[PDB]
Write a protein that binds this DNA or RNA. Structure first.
Ligand SMILES: [K+]
Ligand SMILES: [K+]
Ligand SMILES: [K+]
Ligand SMILES: [Mn+2]
Ligand SMILES: [Mn+2]
Length: 134
RNA sequence: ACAU
DNA sequence: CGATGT
């Protein structure tokens, strides 16, 4: 119904899918960029969306913030809930980096706790998420 | 079909 | 038009 403005919004950007992947997190209210991941040479849209949420969780936990996280990715929200990124991307030398980060994100989820609500950004009602790359 |  | 996902 209503946007929870006191929140963090995350999004992925890519050049190709699979292709170069990056992500960032922004204050939903102001658009201030709070974190930005250095581009990863080969990844998928969904792996980046997943890494972005998990980074948000870690960022908010480190700062003792109870703000929710918005993502527009049905897929990544489910992968975080499951603590398992069910990506189809081949594992090889050129995808080793993204797969390491994904494995490490799953590992963090399996060894830490959080109460952070992970919320679907309702693009059809609200427009593009504030972290979008345009 | 829906989410990207 | 292509791809990643539930
Ligand atoms: K964009
Ligand atoms: K979108
Ligand atoms: K499809
Ligand atoms: Mn997105
Ligand atoms: Mn976007």
């Amino acid at each position: 119904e209503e946007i929870i403005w006191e929140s963090l919004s995350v999004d992925v950007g890519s050049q190709g899918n699979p292709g170069i992947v990056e992500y960032k997190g922004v204050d939903t209210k102001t658009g201030e960029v709070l974190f930005e991941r250095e581009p990863i040479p080969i990844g998928t849209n969904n792996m980046g969306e997943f890494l972005a949420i998990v980074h948000g969780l870690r960022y908010l936990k480190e700062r003792n913030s109870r703000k929710p996280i918005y993502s527009d990715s049905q897929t990544a929200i489910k992968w975080v809930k499951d603590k398992k990124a069910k990506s189809t991307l081949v594992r090889n030398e050129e995808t080793a980096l993204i797969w390491k980060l994904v494995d490490e994100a799953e590992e963090w989820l399996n060894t830490h706790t959080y109460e952070t609500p992970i919320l679907k950004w309702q693009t059809d009602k609200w427009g593009e998420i504030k972290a979008d790359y345009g």
